[PDB]
């Protein structure tokens, strides 16, 4: 009977912020048939997932505040049934720290800025994440705030402050977080004090979730008789012109009648009155259609045409 | 021992040293793409790369330099290799094809 | 050899006919249509919208040809006539073309003295 | 066919019919470790296969199916320009030189 | 060449992309004494039921004696690479 065993020497290395690389190898007394052997994983905390994977290796991407547990078994790929051996598991401790001195409500938000001197790079990200300090927390504690994308790790540097002197807000002016980039931008917020430490608190956003699409600029608009043409440029973002939806709000100061016209170009005509005063925003955002639905832009500012 | 970051600066400056010793031959004629976005050619890349191997003297700089190119051929190789090495469920799956067809629109137009 | 005609979707849409409503905001009046949803939301709409007095034809009928909007207000109208309206909406996105879709069921009212 | 459209309409699909392409939860695909989606499209194309291979044979999901497989064909057809085609070896540097750039900036 | 049908002539199938197909087409009453005839749509072939309209065909027909139907096809969705074939089928054998 083939009987397949469970892989040896498991271990989980904690190998930068949010990440975890588990490694195993094949079991010495396993009989060496020329058999495929594959292997499957299981992760069991924080969040559920499992999968199928050939090499002795594999990253994954998770917040490890709340600890980790993974599972490892080997396979063997039949015709008709999937057999396999022992689970093997190792698992990762939380950090240590009193309960509830952890942050609360940690926001972060992505601005994106024209970035005219780089000749490579034109549009850079900037990063503000606000948090609460800790129910238990100490009077003294000084929270130190981290982010990491792609292979990129940095520590914040700009804080704000509170009347005690702890750090609620921090803000990266320069990150090397990519404006079209589409992986996980993981945050990191630990501590310290000479009372008790203070568990940490990491959370992976997604970049669009958190990408502010910045209000769209130069919107223009003119009367011709009872005709309105009115036309703006697309937002800074390294995202083309093609990937942002808009819509366009126009109110009449004087009956109040507001229209709002939802649109995928970038101008809008409409037919209004020739004795009334309007005042016409536009707001933009990426499309669903390029990239995961975030959050919209601020209404732009208001343009005020004709005569009342 | 080298990491593969450098790896191309350091073939463009051997490259961009050897033009001439490397163009000598005129009835040679070897591949060349015509499209953008060239992820995708790696393999006719270093086809062309191995033949050129095979056709020029391998003496002095010129043997370093298509060493660093075997070198850097493998890191495209392991990621080829990565592309296949793990198996994940269908939903996750679906999300990279939503990420891959987002990138065919904003690139890829 | 059999003789067959290729038709293609993508480039014969006759959309639905809209629905037109009509609003009396203030001392003014405006036009507003909405149109059937589509399962893709990306294909743009091309709307041609007719008003015109009682008395007169729709021939003599002022038209105004938008794109993508969904209402527009209307000028300063003689009071105490009658007045109708109508509208109708064909795709104008490259790839989808098609025919005007039919007339829209004529709105009236009647502003006041 | 503009492909544009072609992949808009795709990934519109794709979001409408997700329940029934994790109709079933057992099965596995090809799944690229890292995030370069067009260096291994071959791989998420095979994926593709496998997934009409298992999955309800009729409804929308055929037809979203087919503008898989259509830009299937486009992947293809920019796979063969690639090759099968001519130059006098100095423009293939050029070439190559342009990749190692493309190569080491953006990624 | 050879001379199209007039049915083929006439007909013209356009479509709301969200859950139907119309189409609209003519004959000649001096072919409806001879042989019937019934547009097949098509997978395998697919005949498509009609009902006789006097709304006018969406193109002219050629003969005053012109008899014209209308067509509706349901169907669940579209894409941008549909292509529908429709062809006219004698209904008894010649
Ligand atoms: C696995 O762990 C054991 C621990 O006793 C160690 O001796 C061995 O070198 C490790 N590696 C392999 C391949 O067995
Ligand atoms: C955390 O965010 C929620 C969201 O509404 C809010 O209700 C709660 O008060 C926040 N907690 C703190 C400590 O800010
Ligand atoms: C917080 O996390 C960073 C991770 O880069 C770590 O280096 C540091 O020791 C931790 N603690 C403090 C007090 O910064
Ligand atoms: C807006 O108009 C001003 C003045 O013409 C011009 O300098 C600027 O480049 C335009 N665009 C933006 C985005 O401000
Ligand atoms: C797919 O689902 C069916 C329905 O239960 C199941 O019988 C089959 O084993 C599943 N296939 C795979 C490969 O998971």
């Given at each position: 009977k083939i009987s397949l065993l469970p892989p040896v020497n498991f271990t989980i290395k904690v190998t930068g912020l949010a990440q975890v690389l588990l490694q195993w190898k094949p079991n010495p007394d396993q009989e060496q048939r020329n058999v495929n052997l594959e292997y499957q994983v299981k992760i069991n905390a924080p969040k559920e997932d499992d999968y199928e994977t050939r090499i002795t290796e594999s990253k994954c991407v998770t917040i490890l505040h709340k600890g980790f547990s993974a599972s490892v078994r080997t396979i063997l790929q039949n015709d008709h049934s999937l057999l396999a051996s022992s689970w093997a598991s190792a698992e990762l401790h939380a950090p240590?720290?009193?309960?509830?001195?952890?942050?609360?409500?940690?926001?972060?938000?992505?601005?994106?800025?024209?970035?005219?001197?780089?000749?490579?790079?034109?549009?850079?990200?900037?990063?503000?994440?606000?948090?609460?300090?800790?129910?238990?927390?100490?009077?003294?504690?000084?929270?130190?705030?981290?982010?990491?994308?792609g292979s990129w790790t940095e520590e914040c540097q700009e804080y704000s402050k509170d009347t005690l002197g702890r750090n609620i807000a921090?803000?990266?002016?320069?990150?090397?977080?990519?404006?079209?980039?589409?992986?996980?931008?993981?945050?990191?917020?630990?501590?310290?004090?000479?009372?008790?430490?203070?568990?940490?608190?990491?959370?992976?956003?997604?970049?669009?979730?958190?990408?502010?699409?910045?209000?769209?600029?130069?919107?223009?608009?003119?009367?011709?008789?009872?005709?309105?043409?009115?036309?703006?440029?697309?937002?800074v973002s390294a995202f083309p012109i093609h990937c942002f939806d808009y819509e366009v709000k126009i109110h009449n100061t004087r009956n109040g009648y507001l229209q709002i016209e939802k649109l995928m170009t970038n101008a809008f005509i409409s037919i209004i009155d020739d004795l009334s005063k309007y005042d016409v925003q536009v707001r933009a955002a990426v499309s669903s259609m390029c990239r995961e639905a975030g959050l919209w832009s601020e209404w732009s500012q208001p343009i005020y045409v004709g005569n009342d | 021992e080298i990491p593969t970051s450098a790896l191309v600066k350091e073939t463009l400056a051997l490259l961009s040293t050897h033009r001439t010793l490397l163009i000598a031959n005129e009835t040679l004629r070897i591949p060349v793409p015509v499209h953008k976005n060239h992820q995708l050619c790696t393999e006719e890349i270093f086809q062309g790369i191995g033949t050129l191997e095979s056709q020029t003297v391998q003496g002095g700089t010129v043997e370093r330099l298509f060493k660093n190119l075997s070198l850097i051929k493998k890191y495209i190789d392991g990621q080829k290799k990565k592309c296949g090495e793990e198996r994940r469920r269908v939903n996750q799956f679906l999300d990279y094809l939503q990420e891959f067809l987002g990138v065919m629109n904003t690139e890829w137009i | 050899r059999r003789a067959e005609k290729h038709i293609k979707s993508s480039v014969n849409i006759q959309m639905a006919p809209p629905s037109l409503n009509v609003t009396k905001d203030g001392d003014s009046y405006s036009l507003r249509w909405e149109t059937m949803k589509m399962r893709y939301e990306h294909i743009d709409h091309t709307f041609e919208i007719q008003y015109r007095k009682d008395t007169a034809t729709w021939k003599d009928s002022k038209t105004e040809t938008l794109q993508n909007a969904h209402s527009m207000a209307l000028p300063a109208l003689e009071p105490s006539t009658r007045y109708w309206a109508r509208v109708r909406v064909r795709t104008s996105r490259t790839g989808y073309n098609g025919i005007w879709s039919e007339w829209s069921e004529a709105r009236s009212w009647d502003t006041e003295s």
């Amino acid at each position: 009977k083939i009987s397949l065993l469970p892989p040896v020497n498991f271990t989980i290395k904690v190998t930068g912020l949010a990440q975890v690389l588990l490694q195993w190898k094949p079991n010495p007394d396993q009989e060496q048939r020329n058999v495929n052997l594959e292997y499957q994983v299981k992760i069991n905390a924080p969040k559920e997932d499992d999968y199928e994977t050939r090499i002795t290796e594999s990253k994954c991407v998770t917040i490890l505040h709340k600890g980790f547990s993974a599972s490892v078994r080997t396979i063997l790929q039949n015709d008709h049934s999937l057999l396999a051996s022992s689970w093997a598991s190792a698992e990762l401790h939380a950090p240590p720290g009193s309960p509830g001195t952890s942050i609360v409500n940690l926001t972060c938000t992505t601005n994106t800025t024209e970035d005219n001197y780089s000749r490579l790079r034109s549009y850079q990200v900037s990063l503000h994440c606000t948090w609460l300090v800790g129910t238990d927390a100490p009077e003294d504690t000084q929270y130190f705030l981290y982010y990491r994308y792609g292979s990129w790790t940095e520590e914040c540097q700009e804080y704000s402050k509170d009347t005690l002197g702890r750090n609620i807000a921090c803000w990266f002016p320069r990150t090397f977080i990519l404006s079209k980039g589409r992986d996980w931008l993981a945050v990191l917020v630990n501590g310290s004090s000479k009372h008790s430490a203070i568990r940490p608190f990491d959370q992976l956003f997604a970049l669009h979730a958190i990408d502010q699409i910045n209000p769209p600029l130069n919107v223009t608009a003119e009367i011709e008789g009872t005709r309105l043409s009115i036309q703006w440029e697309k937002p800074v973002s390294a995202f083309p012109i093609h990937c942002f939806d808009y819509e366009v709000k126009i109110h009449n100061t004087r009956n109040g009648y507001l229209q709002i016209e939802k649109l995928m170009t970038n101008a809008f005509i409409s037919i209004i009155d020739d004795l009334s005063k309007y005042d016409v925003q536009v707001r933009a955002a990426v499309s669903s259609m390029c990239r995961e639905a975030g959050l919209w832009s601020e209404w732009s500012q208001p343009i005020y045409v004709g005569n009342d | 021992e080298i990491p593969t970051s450098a790896l191309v600066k350091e073939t463009l400056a051997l490259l961009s040293t050897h033009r001439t010793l490397l163009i000598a031959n005129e009835t040679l004629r070897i591949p060349v793409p015509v499209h953008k976005n060239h992820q995708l050619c790696t393999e006719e890349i270093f086809q062309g790369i191995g033949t050129l191997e095979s056709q020029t003297v391998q003496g002095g700089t010129v043997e370093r330099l298509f060493k660093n190119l075997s070198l850097i051929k493998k890191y495209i190789d392991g990621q080829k290799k990565k592309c296949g090495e793990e198996r994940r469920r269908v939903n996750q799956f679906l999300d990279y094809l939503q990420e891959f067809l987002g990138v065919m629109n904003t690139e890829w137009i | 050899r059999r003789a067959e005609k290729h038709i293609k979707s993508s480039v014969n849409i006759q959309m639905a006919p809209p629905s037109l409503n009509v609003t009396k905001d203030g001392d003014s009046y405006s036009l507003r249509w909405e149109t059937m949803k589509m399962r893709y939301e990306h294909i743009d709409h091309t709307f041609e919208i007719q008003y015109r007095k009682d008395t007169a034809t729709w021939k003599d009928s002022k038209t105004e040809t938008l794109q993508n909007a969904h209402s527009m207000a209307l000028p300063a109208l003689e009071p105490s006539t009658r007045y109708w309206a109508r509208v109708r909406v064909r795709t104008s996105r490259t790839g989808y073309n098609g025919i005007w879709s039919e007339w829209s069921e004529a709105r009236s009212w009647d502003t006041e003295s």
